[PDB]
């Protein structure tokens, strides 16, 4: 019948497919909204719950205590670490007449800590009491939060609290620090920040928290939100809800574009000490939830596809070592660019900076 | 044609108008400015903003 | 801007950048000279 | 002008799009492929099907 008699029901964008990981193989229309959600367990030195000699202290640390004899040597599973994921995104139709294509773009990440009501577990067979015949003091102290979504892996300025530390060598997959990302001995410049120590993040539980922060310089394609609240017995606070939406859109309306169709989720939620009754202390992370709401949108490709493939064929594109013409302390002095035409300047050696006239 | 504007030129000489500083090196060899980008005009949206040329 | 009340000079290709190695990244026109 | 056609070039690079297989030798000196014809259009009936062009 006519729409005047049947009652009007407001419109909602309908749900096409619901399920696990293999939903993403579906082909959608030109305009669609994917709402992929995911969690990740917090790697905290103890990477997997299957080693039987060390499985009781999963998502904890060991006795994280000062040594007392210079210098320190912390264990591989004594120091905390980040964690990184990657959901796989499908192919999606490109174009060749306009040199345009489609990429996935996140718009509003939603988050919540899912392990938050386990923090009030005061009864435990090792928690140090507040006083005689008391309850143990519940989990508090050092609080830390950092989550990061983006199309590229997030990058980091490595600065250690002191250069005298000796992190273990990463013969196997181990804790990659600023010592093993350059090869030199850790200079005392690295207590402040340093521009020639800029590692990337591509392993789980192998890039520790205690050696760096995320860099705010190179991560233009990945946003991140962080916090800290430190102190020995300070109270932690956390609010969790189901109606907060963090908008990811930048100043110019762009989003965090999936570069190689990757959606790097990176988190670490180390929060609190639990006091062992012998006096030992241990850091305890909690797993983080996510809800990314990827949306298809158009783009023009950065690079020409023609000249790009010629770099692979070694008969067609050669590469020699030679003498250094790039980077630091190279042997190229002046580069001019001539474009267009105008009237004659006063000399062909114009200096542009204002201050250097007395020198 | 005159290469240098005369009005910006005379501000460079006085220590009041052009203040000099014994500050941390931002111009030189060891300097700490990392990524100076300059924008101009408008164009179509590039694929990733860290365009490796 | 009056041509008859102001002298004229020759036409010379305009300088756009003078500097180190890290200025080859400049997006130029269709007809430049490097 | 690019002398290399890119669509003829890009397929030769991938292992999944173009699979290479370690079979029995089908070109060279010891080729086991014996006789290959090709047909294009249709003319009138030839003298005998054993003729070779």
Numbering used by the authors:
A (entry chain A): 20 to 378
B (entry chain C), D (entry chain B): 319 to 371
C (entry chain B): 20 to 53
Publication excerpt:
Merkel cell polyomavirus (MCPyV) is a human double-stranded DNA tumor virus. MCPyV cell entry is unique among members of the polyomavirus family as it requires the engagement of two types of glycans, sialylated oligosaccharides and sulfated glycosaminoglycans (GAGs). On the virus side, PyV-receptor interactions are mediated entirely by the major capsid protein VP1, which forms the capsid outer layer. VP1 assembles into 72 pentameric capsomers, giving rise to small capsids of 45 to 50 nm in diameter.
Using the fVLP preparation, we solved crystallographic and cryo-EM structures of the outer (VP1-only) MCPyV capsid. The structures have 3.5-Å and 3.4-Å resolutions, with no significant differences between them. Overall, six VP1 conformations can be distinguished within the capsid, five from a local capsomer and one from a neighboring strict capsomer, previously annotated with the Greek letters α′, α″, β, β′, γ, and α, respectively. This asymmetric unit of six VP1 chains is sufficient to reconstruct the whole capsid by applying 60-fold icosahedral symmetry. In MCPyV, we observed clear density for five out of potentially six disulfide bridges that connect individual VP1 chains within the strict and local pentamers, respectively, i.e., for the α-α, α′-α″, α″-β, β-β′, and γ-α′ linkages. The MCPyV cryo-EM data further support the presence of this intrapentameric disulfide bond pattern; nonetheless, only the α-α connection is clearly visible in the electrostatic potential map. On the other hand, the MCPyV VP1 sequence harbors a 37-amino-acid (aa) C-terminal extension with unknown function and no detectable homology. Neither in the crystallographic electron density nor in the cryo-EM map was this extension visible. Instead, the most-C-terminal residue resolved in either map is Val388γ (from the so-called γ-chain [see below for an explanation of the chain annotation]), meaning that a stretch of 35 amino acids is completely invisible and thus most likely flexible. However, it is clear from the electron density and electron potential maps that the missing extension must be located on the exterior of the capsid.
